[PDB]
From Swiss-Prot, chain B:
It comes from Homo sapiens. It is a lipid-anchor. The keyword Lipoprotein applies. Keywords: Acetylation, Cell membrane, Host-virus interaction, Lipoprotein, Membrane, Methylation, Prenylation, Transducer. Belongs to the G protein gamma family. G proteins are composed of 3 units, alpha, beta and gamma. In this context, interacts with GNB2. The heterodimer formed by GNB1 and GNG2 interacts with ARHGEF5. The heterodimer formed by GNB1 and GNG2 interacts with GRK2. Forms complexes with TAS2R14 and G-proteins; these complexes play a role in the perception of bitterness. Component of the TAS2R14-GNAI1 complex, consisting of TAS2R14, GNAI1, GNB1 and GNG2. Component of the TAS2R14-GNAT3 complex, consisting of TAS2R14, GNAT3, GNB1 and GNG2. Component of the TAS2R14-GNAS2 complex, consisting of TAS2R14, GNAS2, GNB1 and GNG2. It comes from the Eukaryota. GO terms for molecular function: G-protein beta-subunit binding. It is found in: Cell membrane. This is Guanine nucleotide-binding protein G(I)/G(S)/G(O) subunit gamma-2. The chain holds residues 6 to 62 of 71 of the full protein. One of its GO terms (cellular component) is heterotrimeric G-protein complex. Guanine nucleotide-binding proteins (G proteins) are involved as a modulator or transducer in various transmembrane signaling systems. The beta and gamma chains are required for the GTPase activity, for replacement of GDP by GTP, and for G protein-effector interaction.
Curated annotation (Swiss-Prot), chain C:
This is Guanine nucleotide-binding protein G(i) subunit alpha-1. Its EC number is 3.6.5.-. Its main location: nucleus. It comes from Homo sapiens. Residues 76-85 are annotated as: G3 motif.
UniProtKB/Swiss-Prot annotation, chain E:
Changing I79N: In MRD42; also found in patients with acute lymphoblastic T-cell leukemia; reduces interaction with GNAI2, GNAI3, GNA13 and GNA11; induces activation of PI3K-AKT-mTOR and MAPK pathways. G proteins are composed of 3 units, alpha, beta and gamma. The heterodimer formed by GNB1 and GNG2 interacts with ARHGEF5. The heterodimer formed by GNB1 and GNG2 interacts with GRK2. Forms a complex with GNAO1 and GNG3. Interacts with ARHGEF18 and RASD2. Forms complexes with TAS2R14 and G-proteins; these complexes play a role in the perception of bitterness. Component of the TAS2R14-GNAI1 complex, consisting of TAS2R14, GNAI1, GNB1 and GNG2. Component of the TAS2R14-GNAT3 complex, consisting of TAS2R14, GNAT3, GNB1 and GNG2. Guanine nucleotide-binding proteins (G proteins) are involved as a modulator or transducer in various transmembrane signaling systems. The beta and gamma chains are required for the GTPase activity, for replacement of GDP by GTP, and for G protein-effector interaction. Gene3D superfamilies: YVTN repeat-like/Quinoprotein amine dehydrogenase. One of its GO terms (molecular function) is GTPase binding. Phosphorylation at His-265 by NDKB contributes to G protein activation by increasing the high energetic phosphate transfer onto GDP. InterPro entries: G-protein_beta_WD-40_rep, Gprotein_B, Guanine_nucleotide-bd_bsu, WD40/YVTN_repeat-like_dom_sf, WD40_repeat_CS, WD40_repeat_dom_sf, WD40_rpt. This is Guanine nucleotide-binding protein G(I)/G(S)/G(T) subunit beta-1. The keyword Repeat applies. GO terms for cellular component: cytoplasm; cytosol; extracellular exosome; extracellular vesicle; heterotrimeric G-protein complex; lysosomal membrane; membrane; photoreceptor disc membrane. The gene is GNB1. The modification Phosphoserine is found at S1.
Length: 700, 57, 234, 700, 339
């Protein structure tokens, strides 16, 4: 009678003790197979099972006992991935076929190391696309990895890093440990890791949770990805918290909001399987069966291995099918399955051929083995809140379809960030001070317009040259407009508008200064030329073709310089960096990076220096001329004393301002206040000196 | 003749002055010394006086 | 302390009387006091009538009559000893402390002999009186302002007679500028106290406000100079 | 008797790691012969090895172990295979046969005592290389280190142990980096953190790759020191066709690196348990090996001797001979465990004593000196003694070991002392001009025009201007010549000097104008005009309130000196030695309040003086008409102090053009005031007619 | 003829009276009392400092109450003081500030004054209404007013600057008696302790003995080297002091009709301005232009002591009815009380 060997991790200690739920499934499958008369004609399937406790050494001892006993086993069934690795590697020497119902190790796909190995269980790489999709959905790019030093987790991590590199996610830290995660968790905290993927077994998961609590590696900043096939109750702590120094409450608060991913492994349909039973018909079974074994299925959804329970059923059914599908006795009557020996590689080859070509619909879905293989299963995403697991959605890797149920319960309602990022904050002038400057500037513009209307007949003010005063008023009004465009800055404009307003500044301020100081310089120079230079010889007053010449030439030179330097080098905006500062709100884990907008270019500094030098030259020349025409008085240009004081004040203010502005440009508020106040005081004082005596003389 | 009348008036005044029965200066000096000696005690400025009876203290 | 209530009442009465008297003396000091005089009303030229003529300072013949008016927020008190005779030292010594003394000299009298006595001429009498009234121990710091009255008649008369009738020592040419300079030199050479005492020759011409305006200028100058000397700047 | 011990060696020709077994077999034969011929050790028993070649194959090793346990001469101990993937299944299975195992060439840091209770290692694991590197860090005074390790458990578990050791020993770890194949990015991240001493855990291939990237990133010389654990093959750096850079490049980058490896044979000359020394054993091994060599020969010799000692201990403890051995009885396992935990003897590799199933062995230290690997010294693990006086002396690039960190230096600022000397010359010239004016107004003090100007108050003005000009000397006085404690004294001296100069000059001028106003506004003949000593007392009272407010500020808010802390630290060098400049600017918590108060009352004085000037702006006396000079001086001073407060209150890293600006401010103010008040007083008597005779006065 | 005869008669009368005066001077004044010892030095402490005047004081009169003194100056204030408590009683404004004479009625009800306006004005002080008022105005002689004294109420003898003393009836506002004959300008007047005789100097270095009822000078006293400034009287009525610019006090006698003694010092060159006697007549208070006043013993013709405290000319002097205290009026706008 067809007899096979089995290895089931039931007892405990460590690893994945899925035997407690996969052994009753194996018994049910064997009962179903032996009750079918047409499946194995005149044959029954007998399983010589044993307990390995996920220990590779105990698995090797069990395999030795199975392979050195009287009945020659046709094939072997193994559970835990760690036991599966050793058993499948060693079984190549006995020509034994090994079927691993619960081994997820990606390293078991190597056909060179494990030639005679088959797996109903999907590879652990199934969770990797789900994890990467989860990272992409929430905008995560810097993820750490904490893994246990095992081949299954090492292979899963290798595949995950390969897919992350192919996707664009950077691996920050790769901590690994054997049994104690204290140093690894400490290094996780040291490297400032926010998103951490955890690949452990249940006991190592509990120790990692204890390290989480004892090192505060949780809360509103750390998101932990766990494995989904832990027990629902025991994922935080339910079984053996005696070794852990923490208490169930500490584990529950520490395990809050961590995401788990897992394959479904149950037939998510209604069609009958090969055994003529639905998935729910096998769920009603194996629930009563586990009830008779003491497990409280009333509240806890069965022990570990319940999620993988259909895999053992499908594995036994596939074993029966492959034993039936051989039919090589018909081709050669001498050879039969009953006469299989560990030396015979022919019957082993036929068994492998039958196993590879099997394909049916089981309780776990479609069982195709190495024939199709991939058939990436639908994965389930869940999150632990208040000590309970709430499903968040499903992801189908083959169809790239993520059916999301919005139930995530992030701390504070905001998704945690993968890092602490700096925020570019623009610094601008204070609004009250801007309004204070703007009101005075508007008053100056109104006064200039009113005096312009006043001047433009009566010989009291027509005795003096009125056209120079009107041009001066034009220039000063333009200068207050310049102050306005200087103050409005980048707070009221977009980044693409700053070059335009900056060019408008550099043009219109220069033209206003040129107009005003040209009027003043022309007046004093005309006074000098018509009284002092003409000396005793007179009979000739002042008139056009002399006064307009200097001011028009200066304005034309200023305009030409402006146009040449603007065309040759336009104005761009540069952002001056300021140092990192903690934000006022500590809840947001983002740094502040203040900055101040400025204007400059490659040739902007040299052209600015040249225009400043020209302005200084004309200022000094005008001041010297005003000093030289101190006592000189003209009947026609009687306004020479006031113009002299205005010129002296203008030169002094410009020379005191431009160095100071170049120094304090870093402080936007102080620089704007100084420039605006200097221009306002100069402008208003010039208006008063030139025009107020004229108005009071007209009135009186 | 205003000058003659003034001279006559001055001469008459001088004659009237000469009509005074002038006495010896010895008697006048004796009267002065007798008055000064008799009134020496009743002179507040001469005799030192206590502050209590002095109005100014 | 030990003073009784009636002592406090007497103290308060003394304090209020003293405060009133101090206030009265304070407002009485700002009124300038002058003293016009000359050679016996010969050089008067109705100078006192100029204020009545302008009338800007609007509202017995025994001893001295006082002229009271105000000019540019400045009260003017002006005293004249009209035909006082008597003895000069009797009342001159009480007129010290005046802001200035107005000495008026009649320029029309350059060719007219004094009516009081034909032996000596009028300008000589004015000269000796100026010597007597400028060099007193009282008027040692009092500034003097000089009025040249009726100078139009002097100008209209100099072209008909030489100046040697009373100034033989001057050989200069007969000219208005030369005659005026010689007269000023003769009058100012009598100032033996020129170090600390200042002299002004603000003349008078017709019924114009210029005379009183320059009189105000002169008294302002005198006050300012006195204050400057008081504070140590002169 | 015929005691047998099972052995596993990769002896097969052409198999991976065949050189190890082929080179250690002669040592096994020598040790077995020595034990058999030894009368004292195993007198009544003859030791044999029943060894099977494993071909570095897990399946073959497992099959050989199963065959050994099934039938044969009843082996009593196992000699663990060199290959890790062969030792792991055998070591895990051997516990359930109640057998103890001895290693001879396996150093993987995963055969811990917790997971492998029966596994005794005669060769130390890779965690043994952590202590010598810590001792090297302590010897050369290294405290700042960085780590780069391969993402393999063999190189990541000892890395975690070493990081924990460094944390417990108080050595700062800058940044630990892992790699799978990209060493270049890990080295770049190490460089970006300014790491000088680098600890490396990687295999020979990645060692060559890492040094290639070190050359490509310039990680050699006297600035970087490499401390790597190197159990690599002989002349590993002299191997081509495996690195991008040439052999010469590798030898260039590898120069000076200290490499830690296991010492094959003890060099202490002690007599071992065999009766010979390590030198005689080496002679015999060289004669008997032929052409096969392995670095573990002494360790296998010691393992054979330890197995013989344990067998003798077991035979002496229990009277029953080993012919009654049984795999199913835990008593045999307990007795053998006690025997191997009581093992203590001297072997050719040193003293053998199992502490936590592992022994402490001498560790050989090497360095790359002049293109060759020369031994520096040797670390004795049993005594924790780092003895560097054995091999060639350690050779650095210069004469000292490379230093960690950057060795920053907080340097002061000279602030262009040439500018300081120029400002001192300008202040000296100003003082000379003030002295000339003092002489001019003192000699001619009895002249009418000079006397009318109150020459004593003019002398006060001159003294104030002299003090203000002297203020520049203390303004730019660098803290280098003032030490540290005198900085607040210097700040107070400068503040009071400026305040006193301003007070003297402007109080004297305003007192002059106040007296002129009192003279010219009341018009009283006999008036109590304020005298000179009263004005002196008023100016003294003004300077007294100045000293009073500065005293109150000093007894209330001392000067808490601060620094700019310019981070740039100027240019750097190859060794990254930089000097950080720290400009000094004394500050107080109440500086703003004091500055506001002083500016407020000085501005009140300024408007009072301007009011006095506007009152006595019409004085006809030329010497008593100081209105214009007061106006000009007040305007200049006010604008200058506003600009100076603006410059100083936002003091920045410039501190050089700032000093020039303040010096120009003070010089311009003082000189402008002096040449405004005395120049008319000098051109009116020394150029215009000397002796005030009132030539233009109509009254005079 | 008539002029020559009148001059000869006047010269003969002058020679006759000079011979009679020489014969009358039988015994020298300094020799009669040469055996009488002096009374030593008397200390005159400034008991009360009276301030409040704001001009030079030109007049001062005591009162029969010995506490009410009237001070006159050019600031335009006749102030009645009180030596007991330094308390002013009634400051009297004037229509004319140029005043130099002040007088006190013996009853204390009235107060007189006069100056350069040739008006002698009397003010009623004690009345039902508190405020003082001009009781009467007596604008009289053309010359400037130099002195005035009231024998009782409604009657006051007054001097003039036209060399004509007069007696004034206040109620009728007319002069009932004239006094003409003064060669020089009248300066100071004093009255005998009766209603029969009053003394009067003039600007001719002489003194005269007028009679109020008759109006003819009974005796003329000469011998001064300069015009008179201040004259006094003996307590009983037989002698009277007389001081002028010659820095010499010339005592005279009514019956002897000749000068008795001379009060002068070598280093004193300051003219006298105020002379008053004492109760016993032994002392003689005199004030000069030295800014100091000194007391002369009327018997030994020697100075008794010095007195200073004024910064200008001492132009006023007075002695109370009982003689407890003496006061001065200087040109420095201050008043002082001694003893």
């Amino acid at each position: 009678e067809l007899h096979i060997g089995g290895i089931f991790p039931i007892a405990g200690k460590g690893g994945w003790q899925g035997g407690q739920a996969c052994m009753p499934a194996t018994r049910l499958a064997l009962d179903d197979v032996n009750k079918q008369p047409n499946l194995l004609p005149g044959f029954k399937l007998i399983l010589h099972s044993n307990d390995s406790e996920c220990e590779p050494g105990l698995g090797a001892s069990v395999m030795y006992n199975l392979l050195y006993n009287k009945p020659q086993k046709l094939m072997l069934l193994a559970g835990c991935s760690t036991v599966c690795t050793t058993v499948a590697e060693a079984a190549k020497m006995w020509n034994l076929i090994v079927l691993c119902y619960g081994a997820s190790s990606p390293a078991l796909s190597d056909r060179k190391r494990f030639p005679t190995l088959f797996r109903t269980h999907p590879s652990a790489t199934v969770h990797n696309p789900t994890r990467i999709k989860l990272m992409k959905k929430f905008g995560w790019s810097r993820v750490a990895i904490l893994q246990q030093a095992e081949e299954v987790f090492i292979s899963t991590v290798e595949d995950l890093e390969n897919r992350c590199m192919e996707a664009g996610v950077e691996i920050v830290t790769r901590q690994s440990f054997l049994s104690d995660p204290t140093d690894a968790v400490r290094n996780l905290r040291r490297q400032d890791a926010r998103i951490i993927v955890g690949l452990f077994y249940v006991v190592a998961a509990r120790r990692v949770l204890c390290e989480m609590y004892k090192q505060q590696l949780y809360g509103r900043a750390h998101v932990w990805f766990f494995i989904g096939w832990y027990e629902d109750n025991w994922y935080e702590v339910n079984l053996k918290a005696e070794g852990i120094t923490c208490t169930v409450e500490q584990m529950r608060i520490a395990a809050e909001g961590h995401l788990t991913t897992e394959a479904l492994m149950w037939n998510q349909n209604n069609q009958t399987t090969i055994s003529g039973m639905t998935a729910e018909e096998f769920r009603h079974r194996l629930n009563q069966a586990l009830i008779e074994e003491g497990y409280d299925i009333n509240h806890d959804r069965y022990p570990e291995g319940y999620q993988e329970a259909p895999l053992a059923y499908d594995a036994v059914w596939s074993v029966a099918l492959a034993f039936n599908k051989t039919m090589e006795r018909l081709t050669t009557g001498k050879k039969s399955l009953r006469d299989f020996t560990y030396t015979d590689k022919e019957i082993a080859d036929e068994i492998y051929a039958a196993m590879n070509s099997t394909q049916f619909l089981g309780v776990s879905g479609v069982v195709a083995f190495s024939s199709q293989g991939d058939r990436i299963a639908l994965t389930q995403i869940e999150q632990m809140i208040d000590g309970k697991y709430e499903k968040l959605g499903y992801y189908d890797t083959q169809l790239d379809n993520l059916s999301w149920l919005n139930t995530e319960q992030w701390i504070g309602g905001k998704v945690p960030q993968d890092r602490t990022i700096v925020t570019h904050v623009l610094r601008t002038v204070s609004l009250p001070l801007f309004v204070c400057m703007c009101t005075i500037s508007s008053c100056g513009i109104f006064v200039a317009f009113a005096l312009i209307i006043f001047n433009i007949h009566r010989r009291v003010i027509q005795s003096s040259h009125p056209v120079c005063n009107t041009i001066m008023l034009f220039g000063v009004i333009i200068c207050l407009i310049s102050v306005i465009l200087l103050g409005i800055d980048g707070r009221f404009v977009s980044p693409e508008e700053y070059p335009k307003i900056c060019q408008a500044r550099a043009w219109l301020l220069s033209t206003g200064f040129t107009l005003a100081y040209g009027a003043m310089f022309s007046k004093v120079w005309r006074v000098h030329r018509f009284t002092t230079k003409a000396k005793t010889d007179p009979k000739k007053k002042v008139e056009p073709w002399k006064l307009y010449t200097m001011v028009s030439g200066l304005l034309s030179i200023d305009l030409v310089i402006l146009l040449s330097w603007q065309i040759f080098d336009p104005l761009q905006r540069y952002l001056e960096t300021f140092p990192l500062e903690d934000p006022v709100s500590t809840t947001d884990d983002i740094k502040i990076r203040p900055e101040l907008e400025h204007c400059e270019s490659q040739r902007n500094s040299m052209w600015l220096g040249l225009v400043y030098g020209f302005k200084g030259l004309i200022l000094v020349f005008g001041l010297f001329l005003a000093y030289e025409t101190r006592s000189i008085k003209v009947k026609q240009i009687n306004d020479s004393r006031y113009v002299g004081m205005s010129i002296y004040n203008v030169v002094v203010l410009c020379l005191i301002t431009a160095p100071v502005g170049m120094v304090i440009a870093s402080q936007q508020d102080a620089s704007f206040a100084f420039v605006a106040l200097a221009v306002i005081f100069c402008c208003f004082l010039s208006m008063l000196l030139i025009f107020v005596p004229k108005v009071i003389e007209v009135i009186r | 003749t205003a000058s003659i009348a003034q001279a006559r008036k001055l001469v008459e005044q001088l004659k009237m002055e000469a009509n005074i029965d002038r006495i010896k200066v010895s008697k006048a000096a004796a009267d002065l010394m007798a008055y000064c000696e008799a009134h020496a005690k009743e002179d507040p400025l001469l005799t030192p006086v206590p502050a209590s009876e002095n109005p100014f203290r | 302390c030990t003073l009784s209530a009636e002592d406090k009442a007497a103290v308060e009465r003394s304090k209020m009387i003293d405060r009133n008297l101090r206030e009265d003396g304070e407002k009485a000091a700002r009124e300038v006091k002058l003293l016009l005089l000359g050679a016996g009303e010969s050089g008067k030229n109705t100078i006192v009538k100029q204020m009545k003529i302008i009338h800007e300072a609007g509202y017995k013949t025994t001893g001295i009559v006082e002229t009271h008016f105000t000019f540019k927020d400045l009260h003017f008190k002006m005293f004249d000893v009209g035909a006082q005779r008597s003895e000069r030292k009797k009342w001159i010594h009480c007129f010290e402390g005046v802001t200035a003394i107005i000495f008026c000299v009649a320029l029309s009298d350059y060719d007219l002999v004094l009516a009081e006595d034909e032996e000596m001429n009028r300008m000589h009498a004015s000269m000796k009186l100026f010597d007597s009234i400028c060099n007193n121990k009282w008027f040692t710091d009092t500034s003097i302002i000089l009025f040249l009255n009726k100078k139009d008649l002097f100008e209209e008369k100099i072209k008909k007679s030489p100046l040697t009738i009373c100034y033989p020592e001057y050989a200069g040419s007969n000219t208005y500028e030369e005659a005026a300079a010689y007269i000023q030199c003769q009058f100012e050479d009598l100032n033996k106290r020129k170090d600390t005492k200042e002299i002004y020759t603000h003349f008078t011409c017709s019924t114009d406000t210029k005379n009183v305006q320059f009189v105000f200028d002169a008294v302002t100058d005198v006050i300012i100079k006195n204050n400057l000397k008081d504070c140590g700047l002169f | 008797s015929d005691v047998y011990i099972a052995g596993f060696f990769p002896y097969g020709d052409g198999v991976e790691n065949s050189y190890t077994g082929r080179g250690v077999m002669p040592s096994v034969k020598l040790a077995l012969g020595h034990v058999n011929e030894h009368g004292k050790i195993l007198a009544n028993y003859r030791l044999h090895m029943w060894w099977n070649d494993t071909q570095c194959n897990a399946a073959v090793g497992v099959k050989s172990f199963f065959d050994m346990m099934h039938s044969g001469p009843n082996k009593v101990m196992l000699f663990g295979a060199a290959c890790t993937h062969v030792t792991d299944p055998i070591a895990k299975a051997s516990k359930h046969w109640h057998l103890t195992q001895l290693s001879y060439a396996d150093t993987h840091p995963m055969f811990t005592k917790d997971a492998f209770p029966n596994f005794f290692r005669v060769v130390p694991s890779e965690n043994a290389f952590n202590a010598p590197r810590l001792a090297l860090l302590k010897e050369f005074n290294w405290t700042r280190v960085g780590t780069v390790y391969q993402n393999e458990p063999r190189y990541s578990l000892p890395h975690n142990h070493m990081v924990a050791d460094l944390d417990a020993m108080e050595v700062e770890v800058v940044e630990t980096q892992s790699f799978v194949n990209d060493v270049a990015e890990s080295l770049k991240k190490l460089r970006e953190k300014d790491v000088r001493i680098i600890l490396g855990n990687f295999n020979e291939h990645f060692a060559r790759k890492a040094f290639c990237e070190a050359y490509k990133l310039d990680m050699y010389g006297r600035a970087y020191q490499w401390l790597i654990m190197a159990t690599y093959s002989t002349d590993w750096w002299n191997v081509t066709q495996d690195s991008e850079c040439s052999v010469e490049e590798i030898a260039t980058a590898l120069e000076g690196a200290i490499l830690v490896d296991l010492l094959p044979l003890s060099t202490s000359g002690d007599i071992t348990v065999a009766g010979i020394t390590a030198d005689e054993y080496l002679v015999e091994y060289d004669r008997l090996r032929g052409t096969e060599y392995s670095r573990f020969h002494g360790y296998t010799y010691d393992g054979i001797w330890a197995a013989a000692l344990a067998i003798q201990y077991v035979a002496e403890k229990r009277e029953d001979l080993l012919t009654h051995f049984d795999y199913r009885v835990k008593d045999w396992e307990s007795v053998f465990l006690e025997a191997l935990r009581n093992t203590s003897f001297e072997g050719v590799t040193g003293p053998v004593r199992f502490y936590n199933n592992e022994r402490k062995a001498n560790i050989l230290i090497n360095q790359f000196q002049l293109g060759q690997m020369e031994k520096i010294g040797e670390y004795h693990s049993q005594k924790s003694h780092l003895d560097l006086s054995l091999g060639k002396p350690v050779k650095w690039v210069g004469k000292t070991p490379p230093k960690d960190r950057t060795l920053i230096y907080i340097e002061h600022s000279q602030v262009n002392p040439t500018i300081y000397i120029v400002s001192a010359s300008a202040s000296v010239i100003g003082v000379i001009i003030a002295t000339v004016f003092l002489a001019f107004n003192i000699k001619y003090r009895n002249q009418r025009y000079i006397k009318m100007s109150s020459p004593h108050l003019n002398n006060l003005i001159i003294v104030g201007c002299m003090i203000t000009y002297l203020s520049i000397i203390f303004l730019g006085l660098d803290t280098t010549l003032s030490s540290v404690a005198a900085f607040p004294y210097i700040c107070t001296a400068r503040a009071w000097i400026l305040m006193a100069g301003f007070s003297l000059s402007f109080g004297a001028m305003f007192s002059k104008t106040w007296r002129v106003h009192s003279i010219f506004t009341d018009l009283k003949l006999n008036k109590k005009v304020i005298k000179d000593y009263q004005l002196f007392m008023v100016v003294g009272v003004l300077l007294a309130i100045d000293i009073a407010i500065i005293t109150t500020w000093q007894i209330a808010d001392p000067f808490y000196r601060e620094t700019k802390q310019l981070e740039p630290l100027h240019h750097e060098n190859i060794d990254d030695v930089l000097v950080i400049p720290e400009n000094e600017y004394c500050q107080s918590e109440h500086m703003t309040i004091f500055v506001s108060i002083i500016y407020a009352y000085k501005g009140l004085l300024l408007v009072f003086g301007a009011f006095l000037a506007w009152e006595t702006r019409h004085v006809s006396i030329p010497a008593l008409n100081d209105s214009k000079h007061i106006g000009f001086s007040v305007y200049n001073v006010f604008i200058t102090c506003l600009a100076g407060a603006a410059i100083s209150l936002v003091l920045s890293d410039r501190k050089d053009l700032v000093f020039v600006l303040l010096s120009f401010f003070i010089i311009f103010c003082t000189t402008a005031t002096l040449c405004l008040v005395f120049v008319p007083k000098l051109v009116e008597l020394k150029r215009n007619p000397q002796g005030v005779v009132d030539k233009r006065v109509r009254a005079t | 003829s008539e002029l020559d005869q009148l001059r000869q008669e006047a010269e003969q009368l002058k020679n006759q009276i000079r011979d009679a005066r020489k014969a009358c001077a039988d015994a020298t004044l300094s020799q009669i009392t040469n055996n009488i010892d002096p009374v030593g030095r008397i200390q005159m402490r400034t008991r009360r400092t009276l301030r409040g005047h704001l001009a030079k004081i030109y007049a001062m009169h005591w009162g029969t109450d010995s506490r009410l003194l009237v001070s006159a100056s050019q600031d335009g204030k006749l102030i009645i003081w009180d030596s007991y408590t330094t308390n002013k009683v009634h400051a009297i404004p004037l229509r004319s500030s140029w005043v130099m004479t002040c007088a006190y009625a013996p009853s204390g009800n009235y107060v007189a004054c006069g100056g350069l306006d040739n008006i002698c004005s009397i003010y009623n002080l004690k009345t039902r209404e508190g405020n003082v008022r001009v009781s009467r105005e007596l604008a009289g002689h053309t010359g400037y007013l130099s002195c005035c004294r009231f024998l009782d109420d409604n009657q006051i003898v007054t001097s003039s600057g036209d060399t004509t003393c007069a007696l004034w009836d206040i109620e009728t506002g007319q002069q009932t008696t004239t006094f003409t004959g003064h060669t020089g300008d009248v300066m100071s007047l004093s009255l005998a302790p009766d209603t029969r005789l009053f003394v009067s100097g003039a600007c001719d270095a002489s003194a005269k003995l007028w009679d109020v009822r008759e109006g003819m000078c009974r005796q003329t006293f000469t011998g001064h080297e300069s015009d008179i400034n201040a004259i006094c009287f003996f307590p009983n009525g037989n002698a009277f002091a007389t001081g002028s610019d010659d820095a010499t006090c010339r005592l005279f006698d009514l019956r002897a009709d000749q000068e008795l003694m001379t009060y002068s010092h070598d280093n004193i060159i300051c003219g006298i301005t105020s002379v008053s006697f004492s109760k016993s007549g032994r002392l003689l208070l005199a004030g000069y232009d030295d800014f100091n006043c000194n007391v002369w013993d009327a018997l030994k013709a020697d100075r008794a002591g010095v007195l200073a405290g004024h910064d200008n000319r001492v132009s006023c002097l007075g002695v109370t009815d009982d003689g407890m205290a003496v006061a001065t009026g200087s040109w420095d706008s201050f008043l002082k009380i001694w003893n």
